[PDB]
């Protein structure tokens, strides 16, 4: 019975860590900021329309100019926009049309896409020859590449649906790091800003905390009633938001070790697909499949605006790092920039 | 390995017709917006015709306007400067100059390896040395002012600073007076505001010895400086 | 004191002719206020029920403006939206004194060539809106008949020669008609009528008229019948010139669809046939009219000392046009 | 804008002429989700008609992409809705497995999963009942009633094979918005391209019939 | 058996973490929120003299 003891034993420490992570939770989030004055009401303005893309376009990235963005949809080719003007600045064919995720290097020189092809590829933008060129085709992963981070030009964490997290190094194109405690599709992927440990949700209804260079699950949130589609961590780093398909999203703490609060509603039964907090982590931005955006006060839950202005539900969603402008990108093949 | 290659220079009679070919190979041609500027024998850079990616949009200097036509064929990777009724003022070496225009590209940054061609309103670039000796090891300031002003509205201040070094082909080291070139050592420094422009190179050697112009690119007549060289 | 179809009125431009003191009264003289009364309640129930039909049709297609935007089918809610502006436009008309305002003028003449711009502008918008919606719609349908053929020429492949003609569609479809008002406009000819209740091109020199109407419609009649044909011809090649034995499913859709193109063609045509008829029977019988009239008048003047039908047949012609644009919608 | 702004917007013009030029270019190619149960006839109809992989096929001026996905081991409905607007799904079911553990019953799961799924509600779906020449014999062995003991009929080839037919064009609850072309996968040179071809321009009719507003 | 064996040495390497009180940890949140107001262009819009959009 050296199974079921171990199993039991199990169960029991899970219990203990309740019993802890209960013991240690005395007032609610949104009762310490019941004093807090909200936010009003934030109305925002669609500033910008970029307007190239012929297909649902499923991944959004800024560069952290605050000016360039890079949008990877399912016609083949993900296009780099200047967000100031709308020029394209770049379009990229790629070799496989199917991309569920996208990334722009904090550099700026890379970019990286991946989807149903398995296949992390890196493209070399600051080429000699003026054309965007395929630098490696990072492949290993059995699943579909959910989600690509960058850490610097050569380090690069991946997202696939094989319930595995892998950090890879980028001129070798080998696995350095996989990151493997998740029991369900890992379907989204968030760096703290100091890139020393990050964060992954999947369709087990649980996000996990993975440490970079040691590989090991630090902590593991659990709360979600359905798939978790969307993390982001708290601009502080020490806090996280979920969306998930329950379409609640909860803001856990990494010190406190459990959830803080929920941005829940009633005639909200959408699955949220993308969260992002602002500059100061005020307001958290939130991408419902209702084919409209929202926007909850972070620190009391009550809901401040709404960015309705997508005729299909918004895939993406991402605050420019210097918190000037959110851009919003749906299946209708438009990505707006409200501000 | 980029490489601009012209061909189709000699001695012409005036009054009389030839055709420039610059062919490239290494780069995507059909990409980049490429230029010709020529220098008389012992003169500064001038600005001669521009063909932008796909032939869309063309340029000519007011001195060679209706006289010079410039035209590139893609699929061969070649471009063409067809120049007729050739006068006493054309006897000049021809550099094909690649560029591509979007959000933080460095054109002017490849210069072909010239063709010597012999025969038988706008903005100004006021740079006032014109010569200053310098020993390896000091730190050396070269001045450009402009009579209009080169910072434009958006923020970018178009001023570029190219060096030519003796029986070469001149290369980009700063565009928007600011930005470094790519390959270029971090010696050389850009700074200034409009119409008063300075590039300041820390620890001069042996290789910084040249020729230094200073181009504007605000306006589509494209004016060089005169040009401050650097002996020993 | 002058004749009884004369109103005693000063503006210079007004009077008739070696007649300084009067002009000509506002309800057409030729008819009886009985015929006026009927003539307007007729307009009144056709206009009516155009716009209901328009209206239910711009209802249809904005239910579902997404998935119901494509843009060989659109076609048909624009041709819809030009009728419902053109039968709201008719319908303008009726409303107390706004009859008086936009048949005659202050003084109480009828209105003769009216770009004026003097005491009203009422008569010159109510004109445009009629005139353009017309032609507008008109050139739509025509338009909608093109791309439906162009379509058919590529059934069965994916290949879509509308993917950037769009623009071009609606460039043409709203200069022309906007051109050729705003001539009539300079020309200056727009007329009132007191029984039709609005204002329209050429009623006193039928050149202009002819012209600036028959010329579009027979136009459009020949560009449109010719694109319907080859169309028609096309879904009809299209069974045999299939090489994989298209299913009884596929050939019942295309032989309705070339059944609903037949009878609509075949509508269309009548209609033109209607309008052209009654005109000319109004080109022929205006000389007679002009001179028995005068003849009838001139009979009180020394004892002193037309038929309505066809207004009717022809205003039911263009409601008719309306309503067969409106019953495309009908699933 | 300036002399380097109207170049940068020049170029933007003329990517974005190339983006809409392949874009048109690529979107007049039939595309065909592949689906079937685990270890089907896939590889039979895949061979025959020439991570993910896509298989590119030209019949008759028609230009066919099928997307073989089934070799993606990871939650079906999280990248599934990736292949709406798909024109068809070729949906291949070994017909030689009544008997073998039951996999009908499991491939009918999937069926009715994906027949009547949010995104290809509309979507005509080309059945393919392959393997027809082993369910001819098997069934003369090893009775159908196994696997439907509601089948009361004869034990032959013609009724049985119909009888699974029936069966499968059942399942679909939206018999006027989507079509279920069935097709008994022969050894004939090109008569299953042929067949797919066929249920292929049906749809395409179809829809240009609903896009002129006229079907 | 070995991965049950590897889920309880997790969930051991994942019980022995220094939690802090919800009543400091929110605390901390609320205070980096408030410090940051400023420097916030989505909760205050700036003019558009300085908003490049
Ligand atoms: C037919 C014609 C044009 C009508 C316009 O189309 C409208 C708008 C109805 C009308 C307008 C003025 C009328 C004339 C006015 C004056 C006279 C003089 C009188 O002695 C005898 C009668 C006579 C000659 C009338 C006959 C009918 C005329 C010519
Ligand atoms: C509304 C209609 C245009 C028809 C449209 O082209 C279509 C689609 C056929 C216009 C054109 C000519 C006008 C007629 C010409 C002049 C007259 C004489 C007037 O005393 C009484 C009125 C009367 C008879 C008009 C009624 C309205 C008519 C029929």
Same mark, same amino acid.
């Given at each position: 019975?050296?199974?079921?003891?171990?199993?039991?034993?199990?169960?029991?420490?899970?219990?203990?860590?309740?019993?802890?992570?209960? &013991?240690? &939770?005395?007032?609610?989030?949104?009762?310490?900021?019941?004093?807090?004055?909200?936010?009003?009401?934030?109305?925002?303005?669609?500033?910008?329309?970029?307007?190239?893309?012929? &297909?649902?376009?499923?991944?959004?990235?800024?560069?952290?100019?605050?000016?360039?963005?890079?949008?990877?949809?399912?016609?083949?080719?993900?296009?780099?926009?200047?967000?100031?003007?709308?020029?394209?600045?770049?379009?990229?064919?790629?070799?496989?049309?199917?991309?569920?995720?996208?990334?722009?290097?904090?550099?700026?020189?890379?970019?990286?896409?991946?989807?149903?092809?398995?296949?992390?590829?890196?493209?070399?933008?600051?080429?000699?020859?003026?054309?965007?060129?395929?630098?490696?085709?990072?492949?290993?992963?059995?699943?579909?590449?959910?989600?690509?981070?960058?850490?610097?030009?050569?380090?690069?964490? /991946?997202?696939?649906?094989?319930?595995?997290?892998?950090?890879?190094?980028?001129?070798?194109?080998?696995?350095?790091?996989?990151?493997?405690?998740?029991?369900?599709?890992?379907?989204?992927?968030?760096?703290?800003?100091?890139?020393?440990?990050?964060?992954?949700?999947?369709?087990?209804?649980?996000?996990?905390?993975?440490?970079?260079?040691?590989?090991?699950?630090?902590?593991?949130?659990?709360?979600?009633?359905?798939?978790?589609?969307?993390?982001?961590?708290?601009?502080?780093?020490?806090?996280?938001?979920?969306?998930?398909?329950?379409?609640?999203?909860?803001?856990?703490?990494?010190?406190?070790?459990?959830?803080?609060? /929920?941005?829940?509603?009633?005639?909200?039964?959408?699955?949220?697909?993308?969260?992002?907090?602002?500059?100061?982590?005020?307001?958290?931005?939130?991408?419902?499949?209702?084919?409209?955006?929202?926007?909850?006060?972070?620190?009391?839950?009550?809901?401040?605006?709404?960015?309705?202005?997508?005729?299909?539900?918004?895939?993406?969603?991402?605050? /420019?790092?210097?918190?000037?402008?959110?851009?919003?990108?749906?299946?209708?093949?438009?990505?707006?920039?409200?501000? | 390995?980029?490489?601009?290659?012209?061909?189709?220079?000699?001695?012409?009679?005036?009054?009389?017709?030839?055709?420039?070919?610059?062919?490239?190979?290494?780069?995507?041609?059909?990409?980049?917006?490429?230029?010709?500027?020529?220098?008389?024998?012992?003169?500064?850079?001038?600005?001669?015709?521009?063909?932008?990616?796909?032939?869309?949009?063309?340029?000519?200097?007011?001195?060679?306007?209706?006289?010079?036509?410039?035209?590139?064929?893609?699929?061969?990777?070649?471009?063409?400067?067809?120049?007729?009724?050739?006068?006493?003022?054309?006897?000049?070496?021809?550099?094909?100059?690649?560029?591509?225009?979007?959000?933080?590209?460095?054109?002017?940054?490849?210069?072909?390896?010239?063709?010597?061609?012999?025969?038988?309103?706008?903005?100004?670039?006021?740079?006032?040395?014109?010569?200053?000796?310098?020993?390896?090891?000091?730190?050396?300031?070269?001045?450009?002012?402009?009579?209009?002003?080169?910072?434009?509205?958006?923020?970018?201040?178009?001023?570029?600073?190219?060096?030519?070094?003796?029986?070469?082909?001149?290369?980009?080291?700063?565009?928007?007076?600011?930005?470094?070139?790519?390959?270029?050592?971090?010696?050389?420094?850009?700074?200034?505001?409009?119409?008063?422009?300075?590039?300041?190179?820390?620890?001069?050697?042996?290789?910084?010895?040249?020729?230094?112009?200073?181009?504007?690119?605000?306006?589509?007549?494209?004016?060089?400086?005169?040009?401050?060289?650097?002996?020993? | 004191?002058?004749?009884?179809? %004369?109103?005693?009125?000063?503006?210079?431009?007004?009077?008739?002719?070696?007649?300084?003191?009067?002009?000509?009264?506002?309800?057409?003289? %030729?008819?009886?206020?009985?015929?006026?009364?009927?003539?307007?309640? #007729?307009? $009144?129930?056709?206009?009516?029920?155009?716009?209901?039909?328009?209206?239910?049709?711009? $209802?249809?297609?904005?239910?579902?403006?997404?998935?119901?935007?494509?843009?060989?089918?659109?076609?048909?809610?624009?041709?819809?939206?030009?009728?419902?502006?053109?039968?709201?436009?008719?319908?303008?008309?009726?409303?107390?004194?706004?009859?008086?305002?936009?048949?005659?003028?202050?003084?109480? +003449?009828?209105?003769?060539?009216?770009?004026?711009?003097?005491?009203?502008?009422?008569?010159?918008?109510?004109?445009?809106?009629? #005139?353009?919606?017309?032609?507008?719609?008109?050139?739509?349908?025509?338009?909608? +008949?093109?791309?439906?053929?162009?379509?058919?020429?590529?059934?069965?492949?994916?290949?879509?020669?509308?993917?950037?003609?769009?623009? #071009?569609?609606?460039?043409?479809?709203?200069? %022309?008609?906007?051109?050729?008002?705003?001539?009539?406009?300079?020309?200056?000819?727009?007329?009132?009528?007191?029984?039709? !209740?609005?204002?329209?091109?050429?009623?006193?020199?039928?050149?202009?008229?002819? !012209?600036?109407?028959?010329?579009?419609?027979?136009?459009?009649?020949?560009?449109?019948? #010719?694109?319907?044909?080859?169309?028609?011809? +096309?879904?009809?090649?299209?069974?045999?010139?299939?090489?994989?034995?298209?299913?009884?499913?596929?050939?019942?859709?295309?032989?309705? +669809?070339?059944?609903?193109?037949?009878?609509?063609?075949?509508?269309?045509?009548?209609?033109?046939?209607?309008?052209?008829?009654?005109?000319?029977?109004?080109?022929?019988?205006? $000389?007679?009219?002009?001179?028995?009239?005068?003849?009838?008048?001139?009979?009180?003047?020394?004892?002193?000392?037309?038929?309505? %039908?066809?207004?009717?047949?022809?205003?039911? $012609?263009?409601?008719?046009?309306?309503?067969?644009?409106?019953?495309?919608?009908?699933? | 804008?300036?002399?380097?702004?109207?170049?940068?917007?020049?170029?933007? =013009?003329?990517?974005?002429?190339?983006?809409?030029?392949?874009?048109?270019?690529?979107?007049?190619?039939?595309?065909?989700?592949?689906?079937?149960?685990?270890?089907?006839?896939?590889?039979?109809?895949?061979?025959?008609?020439?991570?993910?992989?896509?298989?590119?096929?030209?019949?008759?001026?028609?230009?066919?992409?099928?997307?073989?996905?089934?070799?993606?081991?990871?939650?079906?409905?999280?990248?599934?809705?990736?292949?709406?607007?798909?024109?068809?799904?070729?949906?291949?079911?070994?017909?030689?497995?009544?008997?073998?553990?039951?996999?009908?019953?499991?491939?009918?799961?999937?069926?009715?999963? @994906?027949?009547?799924?949010?995104?290809?509600?509309?979507?005509?779906?080309?059945?393919?009942?392959?393997?027809?020449?082993?369910?001819?014999? =098997?069934?003369?062995?090893?009775?159908?009633?196994?696997?439907?003991?509601?089948?009361?009929?004869?034990?032959?080839?013609?009724?049985?094979?119909?009888? @699974?037919?029936?069966?499968?064009?059942?399942?679909?609850?939206?018999?006027?918005?989507?079509?279920?072309?069935?097709?008994?996968?022969?050894?004939?040179?090109?008569?299953?391209?042929?067949?797919?071809?066929?249920?292929?321009?049906?749809?395409? @009719?179809?829809?240009?019939?609903?896009?002129?507003?006229?079907? | 058996?070995?991965?049950?064996?590897?889920?309880?040495?997790?969930? *051991?390497?994942?019980?022995?973490?220094?939690?802090?009180?919800?009543?400091?940890?929110?605390?901390?949140?609320?205070?980096?929120?408030?410090?940051?107001? *400023?420097?916030?262009?989505?909760?205050?819009?700036?003019?558009?003299?300085?908003?490049?959009?």
């Amino acid at each position: 019975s050296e199974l079921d003891q171990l199993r039991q034993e199990a169960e029991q420490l899970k219990n203990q860590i309740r019993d802890a992570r209960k &013991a240690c &939770a005395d007032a609610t989030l949104s009762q310490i900021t019941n004093n807090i004055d909200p936010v009003g009401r934030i109305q925002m303005r669609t500033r910008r329309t970029l307007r190239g893309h012929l &297909a649902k376009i499923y991944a959004m990235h800024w560069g952290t100019d605050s000016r360039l963005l890079v949008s990877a949809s399912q016609d083949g080719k993900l296009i780099i926009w200047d967000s100031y003007t709308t020029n394209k600045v770049h379009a990229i064919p790629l070799r496989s049309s199917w991309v569920m995720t996208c990334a722009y290097a904090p550099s700026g020189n890379y970019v990286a896409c991946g989807g149903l092809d398995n296949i992390c590829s890196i493209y070399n933008l600051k080429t000699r020859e003026g054309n965007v060129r395929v630098s490696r085709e990072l492949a290993g992963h059995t699943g579909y590449l959910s989600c690509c981070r960058f850490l610097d030009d050569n380090q690069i964490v /991946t997202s696939s649906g094989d319930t595995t997290c892998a950090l890879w190094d980028i001129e070798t194109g080998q696995q350095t790091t996989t990151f493997t405690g998740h029991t369900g599709d890992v379907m989204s992927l968030s760096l703290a800003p100091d890139t020393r440990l990050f964060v992954s949700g999947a369709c087990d209804a649980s996000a996990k905390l993975w440490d970079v260079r040691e590989g090991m699950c630090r902590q593991t949130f659990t709360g979600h009633e359905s798939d978790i589609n969307a993390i982001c961590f708290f601009p502080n780093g020490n806090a996280f938001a979920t969306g998930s398909d329950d379409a609640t999203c909860r803001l856990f703490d990494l010190r406190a070790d459990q959830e803080l609060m /929920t941005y829940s509603h009633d005639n909200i039964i959408c699955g949220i697909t993308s969260v992002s907090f602002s500059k100061s982590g005020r307001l958290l931005l939130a991408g419902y499949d209702d084919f409209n955006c929202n926007v909850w006060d972070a620190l009391k839950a009550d809901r401040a605006g709404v960015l309705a202005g997508h005729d299909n539900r918004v895939s993406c969603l991402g605050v /420019t790092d210097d918190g000037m402008a959110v851009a919003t990108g749906s299946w209708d093949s438009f990505l707006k920039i409200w501000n | 390995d980029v490489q601009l290659v012209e061909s189709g220079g000699g001695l012409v009679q005036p009054g009389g017709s030839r055709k420039l070919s610059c062919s490239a190979s290494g780069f995507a041609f059909s990409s980049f917006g490429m230029h010709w500027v020529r220098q008389a024998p012992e003169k500064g850079l001038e600005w001669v015709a521009y063909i932008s990616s796909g032939s869309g949009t063309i340029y000519y200097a007011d001195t060679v306007k209706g006289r010079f036509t410039i035209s590139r064929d893609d699929p061969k990777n070649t471009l063409f400067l067809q120049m007729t009724s050739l006068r006493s003022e054309d006897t000049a070496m021809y550099y094909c100059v690649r560029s591509i225009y979007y959000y933080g590209s460095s054109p002017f940054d490849f210069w072909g390896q010239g063709t010597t061609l012999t025969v038988s309103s706008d903005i100004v670039m006021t740079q006032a040395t014109s010569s200053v000796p310098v020993t390896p090891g000091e730190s050396v300031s070269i001045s450009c002012r402009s009579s209009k002003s080169l910072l434009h509205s958006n923020g970018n201040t178009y001023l570029y600073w190219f060096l030519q070094r003796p029986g070469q082909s001149p290369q980009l080291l700063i565009y928007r007076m600011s930005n470094l070139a790519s390959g270029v050592p971090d010696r050389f420094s850009g700074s200034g505001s409009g119409t008063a422009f300075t590039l300041t190179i820390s620890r001069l050697e042996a290789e910084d010895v040249g020729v230094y112009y200073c181009m504007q690119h605000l306006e589509y007549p494209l004016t060089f400086g005169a040009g401050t060289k650097l002996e020993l | 004191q002058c004749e009884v179809p %004369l109103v005693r009125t000063d503006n210079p431009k007004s009077w008739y002719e070696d007649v300084e003191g009067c002009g000509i009264q506002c309800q057409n003289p %030729l008819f009886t206020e009985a015929e006026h009364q009927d003539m307007h309640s #007729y307009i $009144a129930a056709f206009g009516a029920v155009t716009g209901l039909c328009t209206l239910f049709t711009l $209802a249809t297609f904005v239910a579902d403006w997404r998935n119901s935007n494509r843009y060989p089918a659109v076609i048909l809610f624009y041709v819809n939206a030009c009728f419902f502006v053109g039968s709201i436009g008719w319908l303008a008309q009726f409303m107390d004194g706004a009859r008086r305002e936009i048949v005659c003028r202050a003084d109480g +003449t009828m209105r003769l060539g009216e770009p004026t711009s003097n005491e009203t502008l009422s008569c010159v918008i109510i004109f445009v809106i009629v #005139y353009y919606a017309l032609m507008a719609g008109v050139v739509w349908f025509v338009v909608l +008949t093109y791309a439906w053929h162009t379509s058919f020429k590529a059934l069965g492949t994916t290949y879509q020669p509308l993917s950037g003609k769009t623009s #071009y569609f609606h460039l043409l479809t709203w200069s %022309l008609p906007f051109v050729l008002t705003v001539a009539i406009l300079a020309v200056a000819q727009v007329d009132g009528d007191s029984v039709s !209740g609005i204002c329209f091109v050429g009623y006193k020199n039928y050149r202009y008229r002819a !012209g600036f109407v028959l010329a579009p419609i027979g136009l459009v009649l020949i560009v449109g019948g #010719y694109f319907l044909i080859r169309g028609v011809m +096309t879904l009809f090649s299209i069974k045999s010139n299939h090489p994989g034995l298209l299913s009884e499913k596929a050939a019942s859709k295309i032989n309705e +669809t070339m059944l609903r193109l037949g009878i609509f063609g075949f509508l269309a045509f009548g209609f033109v046939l209607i309008t052209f008829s009654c005109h000319f029977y109004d080109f022929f019988n205006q $000389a007679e009219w002009e001179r028995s009239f005068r003849d009838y008048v001139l009979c009180q003047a020394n004892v002193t000392i037309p038929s309505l %039908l066809v207004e009717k047949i022809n205003l039911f $012609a263009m409601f008719g046009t309306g309503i067969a644009m409106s019953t495309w919608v009908w699933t | 804008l300036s002399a380097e702004d109207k170049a940068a917007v020049e170029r933007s =013009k003329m990517i974005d002429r190339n983006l809409r030029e392949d874009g048109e270019k690529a979107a007049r190619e039939v595309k065909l989700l592949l689906l079937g149960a685990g270890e089907s006839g896939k590889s039979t109809i895949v061979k025959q008609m020439k991570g993910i992989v896509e298989t590119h096929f030209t019949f008759k001026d028609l230009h066919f992409k099928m997307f073989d996905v089934g070799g993606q081991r990871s939650e079906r409905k999280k990248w599934i809705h990736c292949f709406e607007g798909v024109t068809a799904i070729i949906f291949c079911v070994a017909l030689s497995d009544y008997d073998l553990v039951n996999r009908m019953h499991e491939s009918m799961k999937l069926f009715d999963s @994906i027949c009547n799924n949010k995104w290809f509600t509309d979507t005509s779906i080309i059945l393919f009942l392959n393997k027809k020449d082993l369910f001819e014999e =098997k069934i003369k062995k090893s009775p159908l009633t196994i696997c439907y003991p509601e089948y009361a009929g004869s034990n032959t080839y013609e009724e049985a094979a119909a009888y @699974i037919q029936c069966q499968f064009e059942d399942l679909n609850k939206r018999k006027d918005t989507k079509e279920i072309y069935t097709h008994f996968t022969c050894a004939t040179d090109t008569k299953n391209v042929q067949f797919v071809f066929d249920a292929v321009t049906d749809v395409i @009719i179809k829809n240009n019939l609903k896009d002129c507003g006229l079907f | 058996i070995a991965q049950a064996r590897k889920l309880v040495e997790q969930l *051991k390497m994942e019980a022995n973490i220094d939690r802090i009180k919800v009543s400091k940890a929110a605390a901390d949140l609320m205070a980096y929120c408030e410090a940051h107001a *400023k420097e916030d262009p989505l909760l205050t819009p700036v003019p558009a003299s300085e908003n490049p959009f």
